[PDB]
Paper text:
[name] amyloidosis is caused by the deposition of [name] in the form of amyloid fibrils in virtually every organ of the body, including the heart. [name] self-assemblage caused by mutations in the TTR gene leads to variant [name] (ATTRv) amyloidosis. Using cryo-electron microscopy, we determined the structures of cardiac fibrils extracted from three [name] amyloidosis patients carrying the ATTRv-[name] mutation, associated with a consistent clinical phenotype. The four structures determined in this study vary in the assembly of this gate, and we classify them as the closed gate, the open gate, the absent gate, and the broken gate folds.
Upon 3D classification of curvy fibrils extracted from ATTRv-[name] patient 1, we obtained five classes that could be visually grouped into two distinct folds. The first of the 3D classes was processed and resulted in a density map at a resolution of 3.12 Å. This population of fibrils has a crossover distance of 689 Å, a twist of –1.26 and, and rise of 4.81 Å. The built model resembles the structure of the fibrils extracted from the hearts of an ATTRwt patient and an ATTRv-V30M patient, previously determined. In this structure, the N- and C-terminal segments encompass residues from Pro 11 to Lys 35 and Gly 57 to Asn 124, respectively. There is also a hollow channel that involves residues Leu 58 to Ile/Ser 84 folding into a pentagon-like shape. In the exterior of this channel, residues from Glu 63 to Ile/Ser 84 are forming close interfaces with other parts of the structure, and residues from Leu 58 to Glu 62 are exposed to the outside of the structure closing the channel, and hence acting as the channel gate. Based on the structural arrangement of this gate, we classified this structure as the closed gate fold. We also observe that all three heterozygous ATTRv-[name] patients present with fibrils adopting a closed gate fold, in addition to their unique folds. We speculate that the prevalence of this population of closed gate fibrils may be influenced by the content of wild-type [name].
Numbering used by the authors:
A (entry chain E), B (entry chain C), C (entry chain A), D (entry chain B), E (entry chain D): 11 to 35, 57 to 124
């Protein structure tokens, strides 16, 4: 008899992230999974994923150049950071 | 007898993200999955995903150039960050 | 006997994101899935996804150039961030 | 006997996003899925998706240039962020 | 016996987004799906989707240029953000 209690009585003003998972019983194969319940991808890159069956098989002259550059600013305050009775400020003068 | 209790009694003014998942019983194969319940992708890039069966098979002269640059600003306050009785401010003077 | 209780009694003024999922029992194959219940894609890019069967098969002279640049500003306050009795402000002077 | 209770008694003035999903039992194949219940796509781009069977098969001289640039501003306050008794303001002087 | 209760008793002045889904039992194939119940696409672009069977098959001289630029402003307050007893203002001086 599964019997799960999470955050039953709450009095006040909290700041909560709740993730409750209850369970009971080709190139990429995925089966019966849970992914990225609270997932953050800010600057994620991916080149040439799962190209396929028999690419560039017989003859190929490939020039792969990946120039990642340039002025990029990522200013984040309280990433996945619940708060209460606090002061969060981003000041970019 | 599955019996799940989440946040039964709530008195006050909380700030909550609730994700409750209850369960009971080619190139890319995906089967019976839950993905990205709370997912954030700010600057996500992907070149040449799942091109297909037999690409560039016999002969190919490929020049792949991925120039990622340029002034990009991402200013975020309280990303996936519930708050209560707080002060969140983005000030870009 | 599945029996799920979420946020039964709520007194006050909360700020809640609720996602409850209850369950009981080619190139891309997807089957029996739940995706992106609370999903945010701000700046998402994708070039050449699922091109098809036998592309550029015999002979191909391909020049792939992906120049991503330029002044882009993304100012976000309280992304997926419920709040109560708070002060959220974006001030861009 | 599935028996689900969500937010039964609510007294006050909350701000709620509710997503309840109850269940009981080619190039892209999708089957029996739920997607994007609360999905936000602000600046999403996609070039050359699902081109088809046998494209550019015999001979092809392709010049693919994707110049993404230009002054673009996305100012958002309270994205997927329910609030109560708060003050949300976007001030662009 | 499926038996679902959502937001039975509501006293006060809430601000609610409710999405309840109850269930019981070529190039792109889609079957038995629910999509975009609360979906927002602000600036979404798509070039060359599902071109067809055998395009540019024998010989093709293709010049694909996608110049995305220009001054574009997207100012949004309370996107998918129900609120109560609050003050939402967009001030663009």
């Amino acid at each position: 008899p599964l019997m799960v209690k999470v955050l039953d009585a709450v009095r006040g003003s909290p700041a909560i992230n709740v993730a409750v998972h209850v369970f009971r019983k080709g190139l990429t194969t995925e089966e019966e999974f849970v992914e990225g319940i609270y997932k953050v991808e800010i600057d994620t890159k991916s080149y040439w994923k799962a190209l396929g069956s028999s690419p560039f098989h017989e003859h190929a002259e490939v020039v792969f150049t990946a120039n990642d550059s340039g002025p990029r600013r990522y200013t984040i305050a309280a990433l996945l950071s619940p708060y209460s009775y606090s002061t969060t400020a981003v000041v970019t003068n």
